[PDB]
Design a protein around this ligand. Structure first.
Ligand SMILES: NC(=O)c1ccc[n+]([C@@H]2O[C@H](COP(=O)([O-])OP(=O)(O)OC[C@H]3O[C@@H](n4cnc5c(N)ncnc54)[C@H](O)[C@@H]3O)[C@@H](O)[C@H]2O)c1
Ligand SMILES: NC(=O)c1ccc[n+]([C@@H]2O[C@H](COP(=O)([O-])OP(=O)(O)OC[C@H]3O[C@@H](n4cnc5c(N)ncnc54)[C@H](O)[C@@H]3O)[C@@H](O)[C@H]2O)c1
Ligand SMILES: NC(=O)c1ccc[n+]([C@@H]2O[C@H](COP(=O)([O-])OP(=O)(O)OC[C@H]3O[C@@H](n4cnc5c(N)ncnc54)[C@H](O)[C@@H]3O)[C@@H](O)[C@H]2O)c1
Ligand SMILES: NC(=O)c1ccc[n+]([C@@H]2O[C@H](COP(=O)([O-])OP(=O)(O)OC[C@H]3O[C@@H](n4cnc5c(N)ncnc54)[C@H](O)[C@@H]3O)[C@@H](O)[C@H]2O)c1
Ligand SMILES: Nc1cccc([C@@]2(c3ccsc3)CC(O)=C(Sc3ccccc3Cl)C(=O)O2)c1
Ligand SMILES: Nc1cccc([C@@]2(c3ccsc3)CC(O)=C(Sc3ccccc3Cl)C(=O)O2)c1
Ligand SMILES: Nc1cccc([C@@]2(c3ccsc3)CC(O)=C(Sc3ccccc3Cl)C(=O)O2)c1
Ligand SMILES: Nc1cccc([C@@]2(c3ccsc3)CC(O)=C(Sc3ccccc3Cl)C(=O)O2)c1
Lengths: 322, 325, 325, 328
């Protein structure tokens, strides 16, 4: 008899399926930071990694497996073939190649393959331009709107709260503030909702977020955009902050928490938007993905900025060939 | 008054010393993996990062700070100057660069780092990750002037973790329940201690006396060979290794910061054991806590195992006695 | 020689002291729920338990110690003598029993406890849970002689947590995303701050102007009424409350031990606010960290809310001025 | 429109069948310690509590729900009716029943299980059953017989706590964390448990090899006292506080973690041992078992000395003696 058979008596060999499986597509700095953060948060019983660069993919999988002793995710798998992703509860897309067209072409291959092996999964899109690519994943997959989630303004809001926390000398967890709309350069800081312990900063300081503000709090949102380009300039890419923010969304979904996050969802029917566009609003996240969304009261200016983003996104999206 | 003063009334300005500070020196793939793993394990109330590449260092610090909302480490700092590292409980060194020439280049790097670390955190524990780890732990010990308990080498911690992963894969059991120790010199010359390999206290060697020999039909020696083979394979495939070392270092940091007194295979002063008479650092199971290595486990080794550690000690001392401090 | 000496070689026999010690005074249902929650959150390297009932105290300590394999707190100690509490960073008081006769009995208990706590941990933060919490936080502050930042009352922490649970149930949103503050005097006379009630920064009062009034067709005033009613209902149903308070106390302990600077509704010296001139403790949002309450949030209250806090401060002072120290 | 409808736009009202649900039957000190430990370890997305004392059950549920802000288990439910337990992955039985007969107390607990087990099976036919109620070895057998479940899905807490206490005591003597002190207590849970001296080690270094007198009466250091103290400790906690709760709750949550997360870690739990150590009867005894999503998929075959083998066989004979007389 083998040493294994001498040591262990088997009761049954019955075929089993993962109960809390997560797949990460694209093993670049973003995908790998998502992976390590998900692993250290014990959110999955199985992690699958997919990429087109086979050697890097194998190396990344092996490196994570070598740290198994320090984790509570018993199975880590990888492959170019999507059969490794079968029965995933959540599929995170961090894969990426004007730039719009080549990322749409990457999705044309990825999304049907994801849908084939995990037809009941929630899709979480991180790849940029995130608002266009969440629409692209929704269009290709044929999934209901609740199961197609864009990372959207989750990171923008996290950076905003970090900067707010630094100015006030308070932990970001206790500094509330929402950055909504189009992810990136065109995002909207909702000044009316910025508060500490339910105390509105705008009520205390009516000049908040205006050019007349002597303390120039508008700079806090300007620094959210500036910080992102600064990190790229300094280290060539960003990874840690996005990975942590994605694992926070993954936690709400995997644990059915029904916490509210600023993520990209199909906004048709709000703020005079009549087109099939995805923009960030506060969404309730759980086991069914986006089950509900918060209807934020926006000022005329804020509403106009979301409508302008929606018009620009639809302008690009109506010319898209699938 | 300012909006801050309108919103918040201050009771005291008194800002005390950080109580559970960790410093990571070198922000390459290894140091950053150590950093993220330490952050996600809530081991520090302050994290300091140091490197000579100023742009990369700032970018890495900012990227970690941007994830603050999702962490419980309220202060993340960085700088080329070691004043940012003041009052660290633990300092992790991952900085580094013919073989005697390569080691000498790391000695010259350590000649700059170690006095600067000692200046700002004289009571810290030093955790050496930089390769060749056994030699560089000796170098850090020699330069710092610290007692042996406060100078810890990552040593065979990763080698053992990989061994347990491979053992777990062969047996269909979680690595946490697969016990096995890889000791001695970190890397190619490490020693798998076959006598201690067990599941639930059941010795694999007692069940299978050929275990770890060339006459073994199942070739369990391949499990230790795969520990060394895997490391080169990861380098070939992605260019470096990061995740496994980062996780293993954070596991050591946890025992130290939380004074757990768990047993880990780390590099310590082995003079006085296995006929070793030279000032060399080799991995043995050590009890880790608030004062670093307080104790070590005296593993019963066979004549062959003892000879391999003695040969490693002789080779290490041969390189060490020629180094310029 | 001994088996221990054959197995383990000792490097140093250095006497060490805990770096993150927490003491719980009173091992009743509340005290023990605080201890298990603190243990499962890895907040302490040492946990000390104190009580006057010696058999129950020993039994509780042993029961916790027997679960050590599943915890990361290496030392659990207990005793009637306060020498077991020496060098505590945080001391949690859950000890205690006409309503006025009751207060004086708790004052008598505190006259023994507080000097003993101060003697062995002069630099600790005191966290008062025992009822009437606002009066007993004042009593602990007066007896200890500690600055106001190091005397914290559990106050409206639990009231706010229950409010957020009830708000969450009505809206179908996790309590973490349902923001609402219950301030002032803990218990029956607490104040729900309707203006701050929000989800994602969207004011419920702006959306529903009748919120918190008798005109309200949805009767949101019942949410605050149910916070008070729930507490008496749990007592009626199981005889005491433990789990919710223990979890809420461990959340405060986390901000203090980890120097998080998160904002919590806790009882603090409110003299100088809302026209209050007496030495009384009431709940306001406080920034909690390594120095206890370093700062407080100045909540804009309506004239009605301000009047309720002033009436509570007058009533608390009325009881306080008659206490014998 | 309601304030909720003004604030929130609903995408779908559809509620999925429970995905990672745990049920705790019996809300005494043991059940509630299991419940708080499971909650603080984020093992379940839904926790169900069942008991026959309706007021205490409601009070315990409400108390846990009031701490929701500090937890990541979004749904806590309770009831006397087992419809609240539907689709549980794992069902933990802690419900239990002045000097009566040995067979008398067992039959009282058997009567309770005759009501519980069919109700559990009705609403969660595919669950894993984890038995904590005493006498655990007999009651795991009873749950197995009544349920009709395959042996892999019926797990007894067994010697999990005995081993945890042993490792704590070993750790205290050696000045090492219990996580690094390895040692197995097997067989019959409680008074008749077997310390496996041959497997006692630190870093793979056998204590028995270093100290051949280990676990014998001639031992000058009396290491037998470490196992004697495991049994003595249990009675001492009962004498001092009236019951035990924290240690059992933590040990049960550790088993729940391996099952819910399919970890395949090895634990000393009670399993149907027929076919081992000359045991021919349908009895449950503790051996190291691999725990995962299908419950006990495998077991470790520990080499026992003649004396150790004899003690397990004597336990098996005693347990079968009681079981063959039980009225179902
Ligand atoms: N939404 C946000 O808040 C946010 C924040 C940071 C980064 N990002 C985005 O994340 C994306 C990735 O960043 P990165 O630094 O990791 O880029 P990267 O180029 O380093 O990694 C991308 C990976 O995707 C892989 N890939 C390409 N085509 C593929 C295919 N057809 N199938 C599978 N994998 C494929 C690549 O091989 C590569 O490994 C970018 O689009 C970036 O803009 C988004
Ligand atoms: N012991 C183990 O088990 C183990 C495992 C994996 C890697 N390693 C080792 O870790 C080390 C680092 O790996 P890496 O991939 O991150 O290398 P790296 O070159 O990518 O990173 C090293 C960093 O050190 C910095 N550095 C150089 N000189 C410095 C100085 N005087 N002060 C401060 N910083 C300085 C560099 O600028 C660089 O950022 C290597 O020596 C490697 O062999 C050890
Ligand atoms: N502030 C809040 O939000 C909140 C919530 C729940 C409970 N509580 C309060 O917590 C307190 C305790 O509740 P409980 O159910 O655990 O009461 P308990 O009577 O069951 O426990 C109290 C313990 O204090 C001990 N004690 C008495 N005198 C002592 C002394 N001089 N030194 C040390 N220990 C002493 C007792 O022996 C007893 O074990 C009560 O006052 C209760 O009102 C407060
Ligand atoms: N196996 C171990 O290692 C271990 C360790 C400690 C305790 N225990 C055991 O756990 C059991 C419980 O301990 P306890 O202190 O909580 O006892 P307890 O009496 O305080 O609690 C038992 C609960 O079960 C309930 N119950 C009774 N009949 C029921 C029924 N038909 N359906 C549902 N619930 C019912 C009771 O109402 C009661 O609330 C005991 O049998 C004890 O021996 C086992
Ligand atoms: N890994 C990687 C590679 C390329 C680009 C990036 C990017 C990037 C893009 C432009 S500047 C930084 C991708 C990306 O969307 C973000 S967030 C962001 C970007 C611009 C403004 C405001 C915010 Cl919050 C970000 O922080 O990083 C990351
Ligand atoms: N990031 C980085 C860069 C260079 C070299 C390395 C290295 C490396 C060296 C040679 S092959 C791999 C450094 C290093 O010592 C290890 S562990 C290791 C190495 C060889 C054999 C057995 C073991 Cl356990 C390891 O895994 O990684 C890492
Ligand atoms: N363990 C124990 C024993 C006796 C009394 C209590 C008490 C209690 C007191 C009066 S009614 C319930 C102690 C106590 O202050 C609380 S919180 C609370 C109490 C009353 C109203 C609103 C709130 Cl949020 C509470 O929930 O519980 C607990
Ligand atoms: N809650 C409660 C109520 C009554 C009895 C118990 C009991 C008890 C039984 C006899 S002495 C203590 C139930 C029980 O099995 C245990 S473990 C145990 C018991 C005896 C010896 C060795 C061990 Cl490890 C234990 O620790 O506690 C618990």
């Amino acid at each position: 008899a083998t040493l294994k058979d001498q040591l262990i008596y088997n009761l049954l060999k019955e075929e089993q399926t993962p109960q809390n499986k997560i797949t990460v597509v694209g093993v670049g700095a973003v995908g790998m930071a998502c992976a390590i953060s998900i692993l250290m948060k014990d959110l999955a019983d199985e992690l699958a990694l997919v990429d087109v660069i086979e050697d890097k993919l194998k190396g990344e999988m092996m490196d994570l497996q070598h740290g198994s002793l320090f984790l509570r995710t018993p199975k880590i798998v990888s492959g170019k073939d999507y059969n490794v992703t079968a029965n995933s509860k959540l599929v995170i897309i961090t894969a990426g190649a004007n730039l719009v067209q080549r990322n749409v072409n990457i999705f044309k291959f990825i999304i049907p393959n994801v849908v084939k092996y995990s037809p009941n999964c929630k899709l979480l899109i991180v790849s940029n331009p995130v608002d266009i690519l969440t629409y692209v994943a929704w269009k290709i997959s044929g999934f209901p709107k609740n199961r197609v989630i864009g990372s959207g303004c989750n990171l923008d809001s996290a950076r905003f709260r970090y900067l707010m926390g630094e100015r006030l000398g308070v932990h970001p967890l206790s500094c509330h503030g929402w950055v909504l709309g189009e992810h990136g350069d065109s995002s909207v800081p909702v000044w009316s909702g910025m508060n500490v312990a339910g105390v509105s900063l705008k009520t205390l300081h009516p000049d908040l977020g205006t050019d007349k503000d002597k303390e120039q709090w508008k700079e806090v949102h300007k620094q959210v955009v500036e910080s992102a380009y600064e990190v790229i300039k300094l280290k060539g890419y960003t990874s840690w902050a996005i990975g942590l923010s994605v694992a926070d969304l993954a936690e709400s979904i995997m644990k059915n928490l029904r916490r509210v996050h600023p993520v990209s969802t199909m906004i048709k029917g709000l703020y005079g938007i009549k087109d099939d566009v995805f923009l960030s609003v506060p969404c309730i996240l759980g086991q069914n993905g986006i089950s509900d969304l918060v209807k934020v009261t926006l000022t005329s200016e804020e509403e106009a900025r979301l409508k302008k983003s929606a018009d620009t996104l639809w302008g690009i999206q109506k010319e898209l060939q699938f």
